[PDB]
Write a protein that binds this ligand. Structure first.
Ligand SMILES: Nc1ncnc2c1ncn2[C@@H]1O[C@H](COP(=O)(O)OP(=O)(O)OC[C@H]2OC[C@H](O)[C@@H]2O)[C@@H](O)[C@H]1OP(=O)(O)O
Length: 274
């Protein structure tokens, strides 16, 4: 019953998915299996997390037709390059045990414009070859976006960015929308630190819902595709259950008022890792 968004290349994605981040092989397989059983279809991993094969095993064992599942993975920063990115996409497929992925992203700008531009050209070939249905970016700022769009005339389908009430990304969301790029929010609970924020708990108590439900619903109402995570099968199911209520404009405004620039994940302006 999950709503979808339509991308600029005519493909569609669910508005909520599960990301595994740096979970160990065993934990990654466990959470993806639980998510699929609960009804998640958008699954997000990365080569840099080292757990692609584990995710692939959860998918293989699920008994769900491949066509119904939306798999995202990412180009690790050390693998950037025109030729190297095409090889890295194919290596990711081998690890995942898949013939294609649905979304393939540059993981970080990585602090070298030549290299991320070349990586983008590589990704365009990856898409042309049918290796990835859609291509996009993660943690790109407005200047990085202008650079790839200016030089290649090919616009990312998605820009996956850290986003939560302490870092609401209003400015970058507006840039994304102007280019017809979908915003994918990650880290929506702020490593769980936001679950006890008093503004969040007041709104949860007002609705008879949980803090986590409030944080995820707020992000959905901004128009984002929302990537969440839990290692617990019941909480995973609870994180999908965010279509039974709506936050009011007053409550949206309160949560929109909390931005203070807090990043729990690295800053892409500086970060040169993956
Ligand atoms: N429903 C619910 N209720 C109570 N506690 C919960 C719930 N869901 C998750 N959690 C907990 O919140 C904490 C934050 O987890 P995290 O995966 O970093 O979450 P983020 O949102 O910061 O980032 C997720 C990102 O990791 C990678 C990917 O990019 C994701 O966007 C963690 O201790 C979880 O414990 P638990 O025991 O696992 O449930």
């Amino acid at each position: 019953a999950i709503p979808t968004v339509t991308l600029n290349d005519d493909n569609t994605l669910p508005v909520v998915g599960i990301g595994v981040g740096e979970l160990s092989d065993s934990e990654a397989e466990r959470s993806v299996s639980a998510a699929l059983e609960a009804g998640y279809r958008l699954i997000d991993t990365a080569a840099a997390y080292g757990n692609e094969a584990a995710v692939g095993r959860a998918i293989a064992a699920s008994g769900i037709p491949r066509d119904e599942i939306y798999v995202t993975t990412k180009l690790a920063t050390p693998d950037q390059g025109f030729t190297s990115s095409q090889a890295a996409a194919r290596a990711s497929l081998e690890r995942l045990g898949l013939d294609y992925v649905d979304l393939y992203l540059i993981h970080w700008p990585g602090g070298d414009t030549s290299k991320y531009v070349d990586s983008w050209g590589g990704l365009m070939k990856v898409k042309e070859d049918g290796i990835a249905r859609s291509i996009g970016v993660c943690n790109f700022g407005a200047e990085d976006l202008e650079t790839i769009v200016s030089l290649t005339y090919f616009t990312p389908a998605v820009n996956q960015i850290e986003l939560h009430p302490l870092l609401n990304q209003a400015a970058l969301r507006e840039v994304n929308a102007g280019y017809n790029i979908v915003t994918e929010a990650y880290g929506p609970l702020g490593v769980g630190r936001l679950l006890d924020h008093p503004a969040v708990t007041a709104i949860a108590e007002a609705h008879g819902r949980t803090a986590a439900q409030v944080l995820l619903r707020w992000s959905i109402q901004l128009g984002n595709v929302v990537i969440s995570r839990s290692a617990n099968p019941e909480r995973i199911a609870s994180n999908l259950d965010v279509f039974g209520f709506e936050l009011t404009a007053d409550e949206m405004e309160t949560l929109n008022g909390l931005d203070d620039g807090t990043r729990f994940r690295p800053d892409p302006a500086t970060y040169t890792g993956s």
